[PDB]
Design a protein around this ligand. Structure first.
Ligand SMILES: Cc1nc(=O)c2cc(CN(C)c3ccc(C(=O)N[C@@H](CCC(=O)O)C(=O)O)s3)ccc2[nH]1
Ligand SMILES: Cc1nc(=O)c2cc(CN(C)c3ccc(C(=O)N[C@@H](CCC(=O)O)C(=O)O)s3)ccc2[nH]1
Ligand SMILES: O=c1ccn([C@H]2C[C@H](O)[C@@H](COP(=O)(O)O)O2)c(=O)[nH]1
Ligand SMILES: O=c1ccn([C@H]2C[C@H](O)[C@@H](COP(=O)(O)O)O2)c(=O)[nH]1
Lengths: 301, 300
């Protein structure tokens, strides 16, 4: 039968961050329903989940399997620069978007004429140029559309009480040009007691592959914005729509659920950075990260 | 102290209604003081979720009567694409009149705008996302993305799709809105022939708007389930800044001591084929035996 580490206890929906994730996995295995999907693989699925990860002197990079930190960091810097060229990320040894920008994938979507790598008007473009007319991944979009990311930063500084501190990549007008509509549809920031928190609405979560990387990604973004606004990191709240385990991840996750978590690492920012675009890979240091080995989770395409 | 009905038990995230009451309890117990736009002040928590079954019941709160006439009229008004508060007010539903008032509009710099013109809010975004807003009574036929109809068509053709979203949050249009949407987006989901809906609500006035909003999205899900031949499943309510305005604390403490009753049922009285064809007379709420309304003032 399904056997799990004794520390999970009740999986039913802060402290002990990693257990929040492992309990969601357990809950989907135990209570999820079979749901067919776009890729033809099949999933077990639950609709509507929420987990809270404290960011207060800890950073939620999972320890029950090693997570691809280099990729998390490169990807987020790539978003920040407004990039939608998967080849530019791949040149940093981070190949996570290559499959979606491939000649054969793009062709399957009917995007014959665009260049390989061109993901269309996805996060980088929507976060920094929302509403601008997308042309291609090489076009200069300087001063075009809404720079949501800077606006969030400016609002946190001037009116931290504001309940409208949102960055949204879901753009119905642009959806048909995207190689993958965004899994992270929107995030909201919140300030109380000198702490910055972030909530992600993730419409679709591949619990074995993307979700651990995604948690680390928004935790990092929150650390970055906290740094620039002179706040301390608070909580990362992870909300999921279709939370799913692909059938070929069931056995790998069952290995993972039996591993003892270790304490989370810390993230250090190594200098005073004044603006979000000035961050560089050399500015960050993960300390004390002691994960169990990688478990291969294949990507369904 | 805070005293509450015995059936709430643990407020940590039987009845669907108890999940609302437990949220309210939780904010009073654990919430932090936070100042706000209206000047009123709140007790606040960031990030909550609750799940309301829609299976042979309808989540209209029984611990305090909820303005059902207004829920229904408002949703019909959204579906028509309207952003004109006067057209809702004419139905006896005044819930948007303050936001559309001469004085409030002027407070935002919209002195040249007609009273009642809420800007490019829900009706416009749901039916015309991406179109260029002019004014509330302009002709937007065929302009922008009809997200509502796209949702319905996707549920019919590809119920497993993980992209079935309607989003009112439009960064380009926000400066023209009299109030940026409290309901930023919603997502639909299908499994085992049941339709569920999740709402992302960025800001929830727990005393006033949130009970009304719960009923709004439940009703939407009932409508869409009907048109698509599915059964209603769950309504999942997700909150950003979940707050209690200071002048609602004592009214909500009254509420929390009332005994919940079973939820009512919602009946759809005829076969309706298109979303646009629903009318007030197509619905009946049966078995609604609430405790009396508690006045919760609207801030700003
Ligand atoms: C079905 C699917 N699931 C996903 O999670 C997904 C994620 C992305 C983008 N993304 C956010 C990521 C893609 C791959 C990642 C990753 O962490 N890879 C690790 C582990 C690989 C493995 O275990 O197979 C690595 O490459 O080392 S993180 C794109 C398409 C997707 N499609
Ligand atoms: C601060 C604020 N809180 C709100 O909840 C809010 C809600 C709307 C829109 N909306 C969705 C609603 C407004 C009023 C409602 C309502 O249920 N009214 C009842 C109860 C009134 C009362 O208790 O004072 C009614 O009119 O009978 S529902 C607009 C601005 C807002 N502003
Ligand atoms: O950062 C991301 C990008 C995507 N996905 C997953 C969710 C789905 O398994 C798949 C996207 O497929 P659709 O939901 O669009 O079908 O990738 C993630 O988990 N995180
Ligand atoms: O349907 C709605 C509309 C608004 N609000 C509340 C939340 C806030 O109390 C207020 C909006 O104020 P801001 O969050 O925009 O400041 O109205 C709701 O609860 N539901």
């Amino acid at each position: 039968m399904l056997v799990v580490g004794s520390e999970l206890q009740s999986d039913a929906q802060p402290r002990h961050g990693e257990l929040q994730y492992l309990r969601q996995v357990e809950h989907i295995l135990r209570c999820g329903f079979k749901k067919e999907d776009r890729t033809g693989t099949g999933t077990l699925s639950v609709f509507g989940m929420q987990a809270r990860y404290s960011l207060r002197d800890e950073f939620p990079l999972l320890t029950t399997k090693r997570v691809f930190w280099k990729g998390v960091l490169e990807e987020l810097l790539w978003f920040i620069k407004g990039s939608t060229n998967a080849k530019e990320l791949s040149s940093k040894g981070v190949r996570i978007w290559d499959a979606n920008g491939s000649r054969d994938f793009l062709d399957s979507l009917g995007f014959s004429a665009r260049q390989e790598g061109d993901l269309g008007p996805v996060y980088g473009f929507q976060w920094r140029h929302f509403g601008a007319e997308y042309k291609d991944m090489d076009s200069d979009y300087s001063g075009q559309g809404v720079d949501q990311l800077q606006k969030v930063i400016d609002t946190i500084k001037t009116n931290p009480d504001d309940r409208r501190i949102i960055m949204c990549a879901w753009n119905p007008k642009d959806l048909p040009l995207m190689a993958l509509p965004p899994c992270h549809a929107l995030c909201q920031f919140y300030v109380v007691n000198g702490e910055l928190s972030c909530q992600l609405y993730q419409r679709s979560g591949d619990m074995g592959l993307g979700v651990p990387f995604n948690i680390a990604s928004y935790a990092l973004l929150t650390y970055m914005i906290a740094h620039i606004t002179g706040l301390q990191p608070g909580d990362f709240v992870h909300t999921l729509g279709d939370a799913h385990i692909y059938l070929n991840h069931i056995e790998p996750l069952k290995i993972q659920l039996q591993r003892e978590p270790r304490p989370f690492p810390k993230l250090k920012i190594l200098r005073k950075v004044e603006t979000i675009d000035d961050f560089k890979v050399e500015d960050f240091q993960i300390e004390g990260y002691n994960p169990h080995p990688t478990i291969k989770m294949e990507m369904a395409v």
